[PDB]
Amino acid sequence: ADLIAYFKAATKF
Amino acid sequence: APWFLEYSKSECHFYNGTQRVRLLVRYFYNLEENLRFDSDVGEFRAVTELGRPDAENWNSQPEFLEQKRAEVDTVCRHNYEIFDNFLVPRRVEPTVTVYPTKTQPLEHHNLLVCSVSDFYPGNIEVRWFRNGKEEKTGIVSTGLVRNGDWTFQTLVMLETVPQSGEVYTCQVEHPSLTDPVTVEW
């Protein structure tokens, strides 16, 4: 039942 | 009324298992997709002007770009293996029912409906047979209706002028079925 990894968003300068 | 939306879709596309994986990140601002990240490209790709700044800035961060490319393994592959356990293999047998209708003028009947509901996955075959011969024309479908609750439904109709002595049979083939289901009328 391992973790569901996501996507580290990004900062739009 | 003015609205402002920052939206992002991070699509993982799988071809024949994890064998072939391909990330696809797409950014939008309101109705316009203005940036994207193709795994097999390796870096940000503006799609419109408003998406340039980010491509240039984010592309100049080898540490960051290192990460993204990683995500095809880190996330895509990663999660696939988890879902593979209950999602990929999920199956729900469809309930098959048949019945006639008018649809047009009337008197007698000219529309034979095969109703196939509450099933998963979406790929399925529904064939119509007249006395053992498959009807390849006169078919009308409602399409593959997704109910949003992980189950589909559909209607496959046959246009026909019923001649007493004729036996019509709906055939339904689906991954959740050992043998194709049939229903006669």
């Binding site: 039942a1 391992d2 973790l3 569901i4 996501y6 996507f7 580290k8 968003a9 990004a10 900062t11 739009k12 300068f13 | 009324a1 003015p2 609205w3 402002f4 939306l5 920052e6 939206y7 992002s8 879709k9 991070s10 699509e11 993982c12 596309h13 799988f14 071809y15 024949n16 298992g17 939008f28 601002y29 309101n30 109705l31 316009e32 997709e33 408003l50 700044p53 996330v75 895509c76 999660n79 696939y80 988890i82 879902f83 356990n85 209950f86 999602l87 990929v88 029912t97 109703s115 509901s117 509450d118 996955p121 979406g122 209706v145 997704r146 109910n147 949003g148 609750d149 992980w150 439904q153």
Partner: protein
């Protein structure tokens, strides 16, 4: 094998609403309750086979909060039109008098991702025995969304799905009645 795993998120304004969710082959696997900071499986059963740390998603949204401010100035007079939704109402399973069923109000191809839906039974607002999904993604840049209502089939009653959206002149209203 041919499968798709989509992770969608976004932040809206003025509404000040955000979303984060996962899709598998066109269906929702789960989403994150921004407010409650918790994971909501689209099907109970899913919980026993996986897990997710919601603060992560919340992070991302914070990201998107800021990003949007940037995007607003970056465009300068970028806002404009929206996409009105197409609505369709139909029964979840074959309808048999007396046998409890579910009406599905399916809202398609629209944006911004925000609506005001109302279930109407004989012209009356039904708020009990109803449910709804977050905004789901499409192959494009627009959203899709489901609304449900449980009901008791009758030959004399009629139902309406009332959807309101910025792209609408006046409230949209889809009708539905039983037919044997």
């Amino acid at each position: 094998e041919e499968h798709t795993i989509i992770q969608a998120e976004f932040y809206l304004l003025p509404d000040k609403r955000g979303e984060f969710m996962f899709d598998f082959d066109g269906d929702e696997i789960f989403h994150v309750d921004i407010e409650k900071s918790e994971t909501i499986w689209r099907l109970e059963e899913f919980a026993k086979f996986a897990s997710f740390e919601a603060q992560g998603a919340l992070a991302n949204i914070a990201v998107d909060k800021a990003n949007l401010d940037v995007m607003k100035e970056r465009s300068n007079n970028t806002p404009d039109a929206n996409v009105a939704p197409e609505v369709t109402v139909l029964s979840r399973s074959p309808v048999n008098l007396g046998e409890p069923n579910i009406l599905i109000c399916f809202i398609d191809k629209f944006s911004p991702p925000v609506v005001n839906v109302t279930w109407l039974r004989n012209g009356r607002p039904v708020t009990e025995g109803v449910s709804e999904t977050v905004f789901l993604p499409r192959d494009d840049h627009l959203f899709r969304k489901f609304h449900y209502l449980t009901f008791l089939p009758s030959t004399d009653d009629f139902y309406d799905c009332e959807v309101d959206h910025w792209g609408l002149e006046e409230p949209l209203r889809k009708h539905w009645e039983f037919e044997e």
